[PDB]
Each structure stands twice: as C-alpha cells, then as structure tokens.
C-alpha cells in the first residue's frame, strides 16, 4: 500500500493554500499567471515556494498548467519532506492544535488508528493544511474529527480503507 508522494499531492496543495481556495475550486488545468489574476505579488510568491527545495527552479514557470509542471518534476522529486513547503505543516501543528500536539503524537495516531505508513503520512498532513480550523482546537479530542476527516478525504484518492 505504501508509495511515496506525488507532486500533484504536495504542490497542487500548496498553490491552493495561497489563494485560500478549495481543491476542486482551482481549475487545475491552466497556468499560474492566469490563475491569480493580475495581482503580480502572489504570482512572484507562488514561484517563491515552488523554488525552495524542489531542484530549485524549472526551465520556465509560466508556461505549464498544474499537471504539466509536475510531469516534468517527477524525475527530479525524490519524495522529500519539504524544507519550507513542509514547514507550513508545523505552522498548523503549533498554532491551531492544543498543547502537547507536535508531530510526534500526530504521526503515531495516523498509523495506530487508520494505518497509512510513513510514505503516505506526508500526504495526509497536506489535506489537513488545505482545511485548517479558524481557531485553535480547544481539546486533544478535537483531533478526532479534524484529523480523522483528513484521512476520509485521503480515501477519495487511492481509497485503501
């Protein structure tokens, strides 16, 4: 069941996080310059977080849509955690979660309750990153409806259990 991350599960997530939009809400099949409109600050900031650890920069950003970037990047993507792509995960993990909820106790619960594996537990924090709560969760038991619903949206992908 275990397989590494696809760039359409790690970087299509990130460009939906900057627009504060949903997964189906972006058209997914058009270029970055046409996505944001004419804001021209987030457009240079999308290439800011698309160029940190990711073999940093492609041959040209604004010619490919959100798939046709990633089909080029699969031979360059080693299945990394993310330096500051994956640091937005820790931002959710400290600002919106109760006291005593760093990534040690979370990654235990993703395996010992549902069963995902470390190759698939990267791609379930990112579907937690697109739907963040508006406030910090006031109890440890609030991770039983927030974090469990991320694996149910992950069940709309490969669909294991």
Residue numbers in the entry: 139 to 299
What does the paper say about this structure?
Unlike the dissociated systems of individual enzymes that make up type II FAS systems in plants and bacteria, Type I FAS systems in fungi and animals are large complexes that integrate the key enzymatic activities required for fatty acid biosynthesis. Along with structural support regions, enzymatic domains form the walls of the reaction chambers, with most active sites facing the chamber interior. The mobile acyl-carrier protein (ACP) domain tethers the growing fatty acid chain and carries it between active sites, so each can act on this in turn.
ACP density was weak (only becoming fully apparent when inspecting the map at a threshold of approx. 1 σ) and poorly resolved, as was also the case for previous EM density maps of S. cerevisiae FAS (e.g., EMD-10420, EMD-0178). In an attempt to improve the quality of the cryoEM density corresponding to the ACP domain, we performed focussed 3D classification within the reaction chamber of the complex. Particles from this class were taken forward for asymmetric reconstruction, yielding a complete FAS map of 3.1-Å resolution. In the latter map, the additional density is consistent with the ACP domain of the α subunit of FAS, given the fit-to-density of an ACP domain homology model. Ultimately, the new density was of sufficient quality to build an atomic model of the ACP domain. Focussed classification led to an improvement in the strength and quality of the ACP density that was sufficient to allow atomic modelling, probably as result of grouping together only subparticles with ACP domains in the same relative position (adjacent to the KS domain, as has been observed in several other yeast FAS structures) at the time of vitrification. Use of an expanded mask for focussed classification revealed classes with putative ACP density in other positions within the complex interior. These classes contained relatively few subparticles, suggesting that the vast majority of ACP domains were adjacent to the KS domain, with the remainder either missing or occupying other positions.
